[PDB]
């Protein structure tokens, strides 16, 4: 007992079992439960951990830069951004064989390399990077940035330099600075870099650090900015027949609103992006002088929360008392931040594929598919984390006496109504979506597919017609010249936006049929059900009819035993762990829909998706079975193609999914008795009882069982879908 | 600058064999250490 | 009870063969528990660590690695034959501690001698919220 | 407590008694040397039998022998790790800290000796 | 009885044995590749 | 070890002590109930957290409560 | 012609699907003698297919690029283009039947909770009472909104069991 490994937990130190290791790792960064610690020390640890997480981020992207510059084909991809595939990193596996080495030599390399699906090649070509030396100096610069962030993490944790507790609680100054500096002037610097480097590099002019301060970004030269003649910047935009690498068809425009996409590369214009980031910069800087700093002007957040109480008792006490609730509870801010960042990540996924911001990204189908899948899975995981940390806020730091009668007390008051209505809408959506899918499958099975129920998505089709899509007909806005929306700005972005939205080749507002409507309603079912699970966990986190004293048991406790009928999976942590399954299913649905629709669009057989997504047998056969032919043929007794690694990691993901089932179905007691028998076997044998364990082997805890099963389940899910997605999108496309 | 041609032939063996071994040895000493 | 009985290791063990769920290495390193009783006649009982044994007419002594096994044997003997046994705990250094009949009248009774400890004089659900006790090391149920 | 004819046979007790692990009195370095010799000699076999270069004549034996020697080195490292982890605190001297360390040193010496003996035996 | 006694004398101590095994493992791992491979026709440096 | 807390809602029915498989609970004299008995936990270091006492409690909610944490050799129910 | 969908009567792929189904039905039919029960069954199936394909036409049905009929969803758009009976009227009928079922169940629950041991009446049904309430629910919306008006439909929150906060 009293081992040194759990130094943050005396109770875990006196644990003569293997669980002391496991709980010594899972409770590593839960500083609120660490013994003998205060709020100021917790805040300082938070600051140091944030600096470390940032340093790790910068190290990872610096390593990506270095492993693209070294053992890569960035210059060859710059010369030919269509034919030659990007290279992620070289392969040095001594377990490889000669056919494995010969099959993995792609992209004109001297050895086995991995084809990059991250999209760094398109991004770095768009922002102006062309040579490997630029990537090298960028990698060493970001390594230095990570080094000084390590310096910051060490230095701000040192004595006499640790910030005070109230320093982190300065909400108004932090909001003002992170609105003005972290967002505003950062975007201003980014659009300045865009104007100085990327637009001339997209116009065939090399702008480096050596020739910096001697090449004018605009021929007028900053006098339109002073004189207010800002239309001189939007005077000579790039023509339609403009080459991205060269200066043919070029123009002189740094800021413009040329809507749509660049015809040569099917991507957003560089001047459009520069103007966007400049407008975002000035708007953020303007918004960053709202809150009350040490000067005599500004806004107090607590006063705004006090004032916004509706009259006649509509919201009771209103938003009063919420300022101390947000400031005192780190988990409230954590949940809000994770929810907003998840929503932003979902927005990034939903807007990158339809509006490709990087040159030659729409042609790279595997890259776009991997980026969308990664962003949606990250978004779903961190929305689940947002709701979980909201439940943690409700259990740990929530004083009903402080915020009495406010919106939080009111949503705790009618939490049963909210949970019941969410359960109703989830039941309705699931019942009728499955009923329609089964009806369509049975109808298609009987040989007469015209009996199936096909509801045309008239709402979203009318929305797309209101935004420029004339294929559905109608006479809404942005489709008739007599509409005020069409007449407003008819020479600003509609001549490009309508051209981009009326083309069916790109992913901008694709044509949607009844199968699209059915899968969107299934997505709505997934979102509503995951929300229902998460808010049932969060609202019943501190109490329930079965467990009134759930606040006294913490956030993560196994059960209360077999009494009162059975109480397993009653904590909010278990509700989160079920909602992880439901979120995985939901993101699997959205990625299945995206992958199948885009695969049918790239193959040109959009009618196959239109007439095959109606029934689930079409999903199983034309998507899961048809596109898996090249994946499973990566290695076989006949030979091996370049997709052998994808087949191997596909089987790997199926196996880790199976091990998740291993940890999920069985709970504790069989393993405890089996470990007891193994302990007797080890203790009562010659030649092996001399060596003894320092910590007693025990079965993993029920909370640990759920965590390990969830981790194996999610790892297998992610690896399986990534394997299938990349293999199917790369075996038939380039 | 540019790493030599034997850099993949050298660096992957440390981080695959002897760096996890050193880390596992240090962690195994850390777990079982008593005061 | 009136006088706490002392453990006698020389008391005979019940008629039993070999054991597999019996004493592990914890007995010679940590504490192990010893249950004694006074059988009025020869009878066959079931041990919680394996099969069946036959207790001798007179003093009977058994050894277990867990206190739960000792109390399971105690309640089996009390329900089946009304035996009233008692078990001690023996540490590695030989310290013997009296466990089950602390006042000698079994914990089902009262005896008007015990002092109630770990009792909260408030109703359950009247405990403070976890926000009230934060960064203090005190749980809401421990006050 | 359940004695068996397997675990209480005189022949089994005599076979377990003369082993280096359960010897009556022998310095721990000699026990480690014998342990390493026997276990390296048996470990060299599967490495030269079906290694990655089993079909290559000559290279199979040396590749398997260095693989066995490397595995012996990892086994010695894990033996020293167990000795440092289990016997850091305070009548058989092998179970002591420096006794187990001498056992580990004898183990790696004997393992290298057994690998060399397997090499010079499969070469002739 | 003289043999196998002073053979482990300079390696019996924990620090010496740990340093020796770490040095030998690092040397063998560094020798692998540029010297360990490309001599036994290992199919990773051929191409 | 685990924490066993007993409140004033106990009626002294001795059901939690009978359901206890490790002799953790006890009955002490009291004046707050008709039976003049109150549950106590003087041997809470021997409790494993099986929640058998909570199953036998006849009062609404629970007059006895078991809170897990800080597992030991005795609390983990280990015979080794 | 709304939503870029051609009517089934004027469609092209609708006719292709009809000919394909008739062709495979005739291919199955040609394997049997005319005076046989499988021949009569296949002829009845072909007649049902032809009648279904005719009745799906001349009813305002629309299909897009695949011959499979599509259902117009938005009321008003469905009302002004003769598509109200696709989904606007079926949900009205379903709402009528669902409210019938809910009102009958509510009446049975309320009338069965009055007597001693209502769980026995719940698990052993009063068949005459259930059939009487079954034939008395034809005016369920009027009764439901009148109980809403007099407040007997809703229960006060003071009398409803509430989970602890
Ligand atoms: C694909 C498998 C699957 C399916 C269909 C369901 C279905 C359901 N789950 Mg579950 N769930 C699953 C896997 C699944 N779950 C897994 C693996 C997990 C992770 C552990 C969860 C975690 C989970 C949680 C945490 C919650 C649910 C909830 C729900 C309900 C969602 C409401 C809904 O969509 O309408 C219902 C839609 C359905 C498709 C239900 C099936 C009914 C069909 C139509 C058959 C009906 C009977 C039919 C007439 C045949 C009769 C004869 C037959 C009985 C023999 C529903 C009962 C939530 C709930 O209780 O809702 C309030 C809830 O809180 N589930
Ligand atoms: C990323 C980490 C990593 C790396 C770099 C390697 C590298 C290697 N492994 Mg692999 N392996 C790994 C992880 C790794 N492994 C994991 C995680 C597993 C478990 C899933 C395995 C399971 C595994 C098996 C089952 C086998 C290998 C084998 C091999 C070798 C491939 C064939 C070869 O070149 O023979 C080169 C052979 C030589 C003899 C050249 C010298 C290299 C030796 C093996 C290392 C030094 C030996 C050791 C230190 C003792 C030497 C002492 C003294 C002589 C100096 C190569 C040395 C094969 C092998 O080595 O055959 C026995 C083999 O059969 N590995
Ligand atoms: C802004 C991000 C952020 C921050 C700052 C925190 C911070 C915190 N959370 Mg939260 N959380 C987040 C995101 C975040 N989380 C997300 C995205 C999720 C959803 C997955 C959660 C879900 C969550 C739950 C459910 C709980 C926390 C808890 C905690 C606390 C414990 C962390 C700690 O020190 O232990 C360190 C923790 C670990 C080292 C465990 C990590 C194990 C991971 C899953 C293994 C990685 C998977 C896989 C095996 C990797 C290998 C892949 C393979 C292919 C090789 C701490 C307050 C706990 C808490 O407050 O206690 C009451 C708690 O119960 N969080
Ligand atoms: C104007 C001055 C200023 C500036 C620039 C910063 C900057 C920062 N502070 Mg802050 N801070 C300030 C003043 C300032 N601080 C003051 C005055 C106080 C005291 C009141 C604090 C108190 C404070 C605390 C307490 C903490 C910080 C932290 C941070 C970091 C936030 C995380 C980050 O890097 O953003 C990354 C995010 C962005 C740059 C933008 C957000 C992303 C959105 C979605 C836009 C995305 C843009 C685009 C679409 C994507 C581009 C990338 C893609 C193409 C690949 C950052 C380094 C945190 C820290 O230590 O580091 C983590 C932290 O915990 N600050
Ligand atoms: C022995 C049978 C078996 C089993 C148990 C598994 C198990 C698995 N496979 Mg594998 N598979 C197998 C055989 C098997 N495989 C064979 C023989 C093949 C052909 C070579 C495949 C081809 C295959 C592919 C191509 C994929 C898997 C995937 C998966 C995972 C399922 C993830 C999940 O829960 O999705 C939950 C279920 C869903 C998300 C949807 C189910 C599929 C439906 C039909 C699509 C339509 C959904 C749509 C949105 C409408 C439904 C909405 C609803 C309201 C009705 C898991 C690892 C997937 C994976 O790795 O993770 C995504 C994957 O992409 N497998
Ligand atoms: C809330 C869901 C919803 C949605 C998204 C729509 C969407 C639509 N309706 Mg509808 N509508 C709805 C519910 C809805 N309806 C309901 C419940 C009714 C009452 C029965 C109507 C009655 C209605 C009429 C009377 C008309 C529309 C029309 C329209 C279209 C244009 C609406 C507009 O402002 O221009 C559009 C497709 C118009 C149309 O046909 O578009 C050309 C039209 O004339 N709607
Ligand atoms: C083949 C046809 C078919 C079938 C089998 C189903 C089957 C089902 N429907 Mg669906 N439905 C259909 C067609 C169909 N529907 C059509 C065509 C529409 C119109 C577009 C709807 C609209 C609809 C709604 C709005 C709801 C259902 C619900 C249900 C489910 C439970 C019904 C219930 O509780 O029992 C019968 C009903 C009761 C025992 C209680 C009565 C409750 C009803 C719904 C209230 C009716 C009066 C109300 C005041 C009117 C306003 C409704 C409100 C939503 C605005 C069940 C799976 C319900 C559901 O899934 O809930 C989770 C539900 O809320 N259906
Ligand atoms: C006739 C009795 C009755 C009535 C009036 C209601 C009414 C309601 N229920 Mg409930 N429900 C019932 C029976 C009933 N339920 C039964 C038997 C079950 C068990 C399967 C449920 C399970 C259930 C769940 C899980 C949920 C509801 C919800 C709801 C609400 C949404 C409306 C709806 O249609 O939900 C849909 C209801 C169903 C799909 C259940 C249908 C069950 C069968 C098919 C109907 C039984 C009819 C009954 C036998 C008739 C008896 C007549 C008598 C003469 C014999 C509403 C308050 C939801 C809610 O809270 O919304 C706020 C919700 O999440 N109910
Ligand atoms: C309130 C609802 C008002 C609907 C008015 C419909 C007027 C036109 C009409 O009666 O012609 C059709 C005849 O259908 C019929 O068979 C008569 C339906 C009668 C509807 C009013 C009750 C109905 O519309 P449709 O059958 O062409 O609609 C597509 C199927 N949903
Ligand atoms: C549990 C809990 C929690 C959490 C929560 C969450 C997690 C949430 C989420 C939430 C969400 C996630 C939300 C979202 C929302 C959204 C919205 C609200 C949106 C809106 C939009 C709009 C309004 C738009 C508009 C427009 C435009 C602008 C353009 C186009 C047109 C239109 C008009 C459409 C916390 C921590 C707090 C604590 C307490 C409890
Ligand atoms: S079971 Fe409950 S009410 Fe009965 S004596 Fe024990 S704590 Fe009191
Ligand atoms: S949880 Fe079990 S061992 Fe602990 S006091 Fe209750 S009944 Fe006794």
Please provide a written account of the structure.
This is part of a larger assembly, with 7 protein chains of 7 kinds. Chain C contains 2 helices and 6 strands. By secondary structure, chain C is α+β, with helices and mostly antiparallel strands. The longest helix of chain C has 14 residues, at 67-80. The N and C termini of chain E lie far apart (54 Å). Chain E is mainly alpha-helical. Chain E has one helix at residues 14-31. Chain F has 80 residues and is of the alpha+beta class. The two termini of chain F are 18 Å apart. Chain G has helices at residues 13-29, 37-56, 77-80, 84-112, 118-123, 127-134, 140-150, and strands at 6-7, 62-63, 69-70. In chain G, strands 1-2-3 form a 3-stranded antiparallel beta sheet, with no helix packed on it. In chain G, helix 1 runs antiparallel to helix 2 and helix 4 packs antiparallel against helix 6 (127-134). Chains in contact: A-B, A-C, A-D, A-E, A-F, A-G, B-D, B-E, C-D, C-F, D-E. Chain A binds chain C through residues 32, 35-39, 42, 395-400, 542, 548-549, 551-552, 554, 679-680, 683, 692, and chain C through 20-21, 24-25, 124-125, 127, 129-132, 134-135, 137, 139-141. One chlorophyll A (CLA) sits between chains G (101-102, 104-106, 108, 125, 130, 133) and A (420-421, 423-424, 427). It is classed as photosynthesis. The entry lists the keywords iron homeostasis, membrane protein, photosystem I, Dunaliella, green alga, PSI-LHCI supercomplex, tidi, thylakoid iron-deficiency induced protein, photosynthetic apparatus, photosynthesis, eukaryotes. Dunaliella tertiolecta PSI-LHCI supercomplex. Chain A: Photosystem I P700 chlorophyll a apoprotein A2.
Helix content of chain A: 55-70%
Q: How would you describe the oligomerization state of the chains in this entry?
A: part of a larger assembly
Judged by helices, strands and strand pairing, the structural class of chain C is: alpha+beta
Order of helices and strands of chain C: HEEEEHEE
- Tell me the helix content of chain C: 10-25%
Globally, the shape of chain A reads: globular
Q: Which sheet architecture does the biggest sheet of chain A show? A: 2 strands, antiparallel
**Ligands, ions, cofactors:** chlorophyll A, phosphatidylethanolamine, beta-carotene, iron/sulfur cluster
Give Rg of chain C in angstroms.
20 Å
N-to-C span of chain C: 33 Å
Count helical runs of chain A: 28
> What is Rg of chain A?
29 Å
PDB class: photosynthesis
Keywords: iron homeostasis, membrane protein, photosystem I, Dunaliella, green alga, PSI-LHCI supercomplex, tidi, thylakoid iron-deficiency induced protein, photosynthetic apparatus, photosynthesis, eukaryotes
Entry title: Dunaliella tertiolecta PSI-LHCI supercomplex
Chain A: Photosystem I P700 chlorophyll a apoprotein A2
Question: What's this, in brief?
Answer:
It is classed as photosynthesis. The structure is cut from a larger assembly and holds 7 protein chains of 7 kinds. Chain A is mainly alpha-helical and 734 residues long.
Give the tags.
part of a larger assembly, 7 chains, F: 80 residues, alpha+beta, two-stranded antiparallel sheet, 4 strands, 20% strand, elongated, G: mainly alpha, three-stranded antiparallel β-sheet, 3 strands, 58% helix, binds phosphatidylethanolamine, binds beta-carotene, binds iron/sulfur cluster, photosynthesis
């Amino acid at each position: 007992a009293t081992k040194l490994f759990p130094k943050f937990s005396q109770g875990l130190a006196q644990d003569p079992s293997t669980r002391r290791i496991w709980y010594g790792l899972a409770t590593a960064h839960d500083f609120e439960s660490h013994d003998g610690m205060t709020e100021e020390n917790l805040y300082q640890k938070i600051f140091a951990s944030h600096f470390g997480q940032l340093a790790i981020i910068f190290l990872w992207t610096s390593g990506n830069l270095f492993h693209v510059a070294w053992q890569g084909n960035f210059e060859q991809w710059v010369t030919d951004p269509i034919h030659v595939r990007p290279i992620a990193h070289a392969i040095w596996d001594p377990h490889f064989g000669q056919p494995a080495v010969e099959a993995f030599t792609r992209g004109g390399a001297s050895g086995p390399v991995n084809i990059a699906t991250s999209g760094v090649y398109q991004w770095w070509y768009t922002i102006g990077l062309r040579s490997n030396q630029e990537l090298y100096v960028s990698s060493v610069f970001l390594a230095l940035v990570s080094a000084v962030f390590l310096f910051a993490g060490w230095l701000h944790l040192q004595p006499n330099f640790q910030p005070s507790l109230s320093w982190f609680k300065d909400a108004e100054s932090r909001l003002n600075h992170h609105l003005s500096g972290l967002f505003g002037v950062s975007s201003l610097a980014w659009t300045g870099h865009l104007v100085h480097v990327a637009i001339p590099e997209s116009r065939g002019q090399h702008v480096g650090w050596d020739n910096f301060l001697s090449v004018l970004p605009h021929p007028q030269g900053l006098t339109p900015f002073w004189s207010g003649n800002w239309a001189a910047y939007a005077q000579n935009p790039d023509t339609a027949s403009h080459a991205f690498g060269t200066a043919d068809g070029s123009g002189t425009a740094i800021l413009t609103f040329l809507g749509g996409f660049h015809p040569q590369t099917q991507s957003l214009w560089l001047s459009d992006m520069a103007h966007h980031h400049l407008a975002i910069a000035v708007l953020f800087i303007v918004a960053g002088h709202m809150y009350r700093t040490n000067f005599g002007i500004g806004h107090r957040l607590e006063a705004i929360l006090e004032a916004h109480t509706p009259p006649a008792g509509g919201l009771g006490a209103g938003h009063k008392g919420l300022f101390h609730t947000v400031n005192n509870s780190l988990h409230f801010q954590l949940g809000l931040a994770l929810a907003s960042v998840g929503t932003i990540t979902s927005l990034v996924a939903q807007h990158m594929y339809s509006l490709p911001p990087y040159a030659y990204l729409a042609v790279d189908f595997t890259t776009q598919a991997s980026l969308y899948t990664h962003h949606q899975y990250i978004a779903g995981f961190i929305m689940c984390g947002a709701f979980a940390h909201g439940a943690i806020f409700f259990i740990r730091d929530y004083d009903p006496e402080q915020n009495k009668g406010n919106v939080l007390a009111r949503v705790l008051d009618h939490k049963e109504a909210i949970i019941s209505h969410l359960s109703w809408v989830s039941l309705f959506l699931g019942f009728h979506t499955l009923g329609l899918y089964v009806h369509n499958d049975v109808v298609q099975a009987f040989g007469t597919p015209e009996k199936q129920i096909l509801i045309e998505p008239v709402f979203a089709q009318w929305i797309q017609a209101a935004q420029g899509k004339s294929l559905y007909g109608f006479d809404l806005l942005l489709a008739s010249s007599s509409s005020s929306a069409y007449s407003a700005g008819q020479s600003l972005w509609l001549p490009g936006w309508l051209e981009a939205i009326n083309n069916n080749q790109n992913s901008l507002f694709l044509t949607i049929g009844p199968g699209d409507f059915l899968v969107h309603h299934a997505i709505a079912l997934g979102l509503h059900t995951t929300t229902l699970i998460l808010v049932k966990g969060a609202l019943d986190a501190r109490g329930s009819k079965l467990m009134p004293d759930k606040k006294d048991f913490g956030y993560s406790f196994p059960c209360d035993g077999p009494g009162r009928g059975g109480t397993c999976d009653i904590s909010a942590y278990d509700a989160f762990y079920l909602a992880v399954f439901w979120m995985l299913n939901t993101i699997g649905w959205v990625t299945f829909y995206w992958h199948w629709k885009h695969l049918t669009l790239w193959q040109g057989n959009v009618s196959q998706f239109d007439e095959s997504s109606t029934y689930l047998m079409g999903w199983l056969r034309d998507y899961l079975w048809l596109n898996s032919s090249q994946l499973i043929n990566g290695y076989n007794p006949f030979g091996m193609n370049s997709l052998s690694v994808w087949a191997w990691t596909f089987l790997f993901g199926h196996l880790v999914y199976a091990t998740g089932f291993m940890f999920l179905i069985s709970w504790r007691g069989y393993w405890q008795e089996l470990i007891e028998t193994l302990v007797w076997a080890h203790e009562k044998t010659p030649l092996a009882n001399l060596v003894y364990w320092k910590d007693k082997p025990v079965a993993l805890s029920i909370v640990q069982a759920r965590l390990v099963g969830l981790a194996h389940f999610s790892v297998g899910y992610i690896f399986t879908y990534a394997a299938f997605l990349i293999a199917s999108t790369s075996g038939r496309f380039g | 600058f540019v790493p030599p041609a034997w850099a993949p032939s050298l660096f992957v063996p440390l981080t695959g064999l002897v760096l996890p071994a050193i880390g596992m040895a240090w962690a195994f000493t850390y777990i079982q250490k008593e005061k | 009870p009136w006088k706490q009985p002392e453990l006698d290791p020389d008391t005979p063990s019940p008629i039993f063969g070999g054991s597999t769920g019996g004493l592990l290495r914890k007995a010679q390193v940590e504490e192990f528990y010893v249950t004694t009783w006074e059988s009025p006649k020869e009878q066959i009982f079931e041990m919680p660590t394996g099969g069946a044994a036959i207790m001798r007419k007179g003093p009977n002594l058994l050894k277990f690695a867990r206190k739960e096994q000792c109390l399971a044997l105690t309640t089996q003997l009390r329900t089946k034959f009304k035996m009233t046994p008692c078990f001690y705990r023996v540490y590695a250094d030989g310290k013997v501690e009296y466990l089950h009949p602390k006042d000698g009248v079994y914990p089902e009774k009262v005896n008007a001698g015990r002092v109630g400890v770990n009792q909260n004089m408030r109703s359950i659900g009247e405990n403070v919220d976890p926000i009230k006790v934060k960064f203090t090391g005190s749980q809401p149920f421990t006050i | 407590m359940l004695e068996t004819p397997v675990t209480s046979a005189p022949i089994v007790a005599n076979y377990l008694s003369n082993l280096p692990a359960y010897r009556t009195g022998v310095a721990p370095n000699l026990r480690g040397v014998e342990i390493g010799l026997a276990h390296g000699f048996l470990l060299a076999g599967p490495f030269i039998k079906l290694g990655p270069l089993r079909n290559v004549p000559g290279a199979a034996e040396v590749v398997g022998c260095m693989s066995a020697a490397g595995l012996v080195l990892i086994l010695a490292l894990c033996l020293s790790l167990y000795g440092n982890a289990a016997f850091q605190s305070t009548s058989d001297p092998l179970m002591s800290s420096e006794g187990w360390a001498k056992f580990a040193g004898g183990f790696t010496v004997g393992g290298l000796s057994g690998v060399a003996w397997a090499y010079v035996l499969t070469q002739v | 009885e003289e043999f196998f006694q002073r053979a482990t004398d300079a390696v019996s101590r924990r620090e010496s044995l740990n340093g020796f095994v770490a040095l030998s493992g690092i040397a063998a791992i560094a020798l692998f590749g540029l010297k360990g491979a490309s001599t036994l026709e290992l199919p990773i440096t051929k191409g | 070890a685990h924490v066993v807390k007993i409140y004033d809602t106990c009626i002294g029915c001795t059901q939690c002590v009978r359901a206890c498989p490790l002799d953790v609970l006890e009955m002490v004299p009291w004046d707050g109930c008709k039976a003049a008995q109150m549950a106590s936990s003087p041997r809470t270091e021997d409790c494993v957290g099986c929640k058998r006492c909570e199953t036998a409690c006849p009062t609404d909610f629970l007059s006895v409560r078991v809170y897990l944490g800080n597992e030991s050799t005795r609390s983990l129910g280990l015979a080794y | 012609d709304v939503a870029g969908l051609t009517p089934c009567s004027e469609s092209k792929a609708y006719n292709k699907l009809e000919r394909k189904e008739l062709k495979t039905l005739e291919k199955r039919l040609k394997k049997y003698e005319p005076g046989s029960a499988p021949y009569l069954a296949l002829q009845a199936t072909k007649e049902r297919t032809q009648n279904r394909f005719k009745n799906y036409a001349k009813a305002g049905l629309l299909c897009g690029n695949d011959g499979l009929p599509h259902l117009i969803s938005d009321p008003g758009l469905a009302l002004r283009f003769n598509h109200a009976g696709e989904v606007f009227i079926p949900t009205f009928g379903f709402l009528y039947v669902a409210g019938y079922i809910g009102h009958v169940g509510r009446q049975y629950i309320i009338k069965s909770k009055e007597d001693a041991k209502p769980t026995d009446k719940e698990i052993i049904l009063d068949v005459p009472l259930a059939l009487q309430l079954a034939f008395q629910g034809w005016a369920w919306p009027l009764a439901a909104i009148q109980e809403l008006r007099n407040g007997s439909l809703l229960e006060k929150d003071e009398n409803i069991t509430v989970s602890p906060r």
